[PDB]
């Protein structure tokens, strides 16, 4: 089965990097490339699934067409202290009452982590809203980026 995931975060938070990481391309190969969607096979419990990622550009609000999905990937940049505030805002605005599972991903984990300019820490925010702990991620690797978050996203997408 095919599952859809909306990747949401500020400009230059690493959304495009997440999509290309699904395609198995590290940051090194990405920067030598001149879509807002990405799909690949993801295996959960030995079974073949398809995960379709949607790059959602930073905006004031999301339309009903942008909201519908099987799982939401809230991406913030650990080197950008204003990145998580957007994720929290979008969540409360569209997904807090949607019964759609959300996963907060701390992208660019290879960089130095700074204090986010939000009243609630990303860790506390996840605990407050029954969400999994913030998932560390980076596509700036020697080999292909880890597909751990994609297995987890697909797993959550299989919720009824
Ligand atoms: N160090 C590091 N830099 C990254 C990573 N992912 C993206 N970047 C850099 O962040 C910049 C913008 O990221 P981008 O993928 O365009 O995010 P987007 O605009 O939200 O889709 C690019 O110049 C990338 O080189 C990462 O995992 N590690
Ligand atoms: Cl954007």
Numbering used by the authors: 417 to 450, 455 to 580
The publication says:
We also find that despite considerable similarities between these two substrates, Parkin modifies hMiro1 much more robustly than hMiro2.
Unexpectedly, both domains crystallized as symmetric dimers. The dimer interface is a highly conserved hydrophobic surface along one face of the cGTPase domain, which, in the intact hMiro1-BC structure, forms the interface with the second hidden EF hand (hEF2). Interestingly, although the same conserved residues mediate dimerization in hMiro1-C and hMiro2-C, their dimer relationships differ significantly. We performed size exclusion chromatography with in-line multi-angle light scattering (SEC-MALS) and confirmed that both hMiro1-C and hMiro2-C dimerize in solution. Subsequently, we successfully disrupted dimerization of hMiro1-C in solution by introducing three mutations at the hydrophobic interface (V418R, Y470S, L472A), thereby generating a stable hMiro1 cGTPase monomer (hMiro1-CM). We note that the two lysines in addition to K572 identified as ubiquitinated by mass spectrometry of the hMiro1-CD, K454 and K512, can be mapped in the dimer, but not the monomer, to roughly the same continuous surface containing K572.
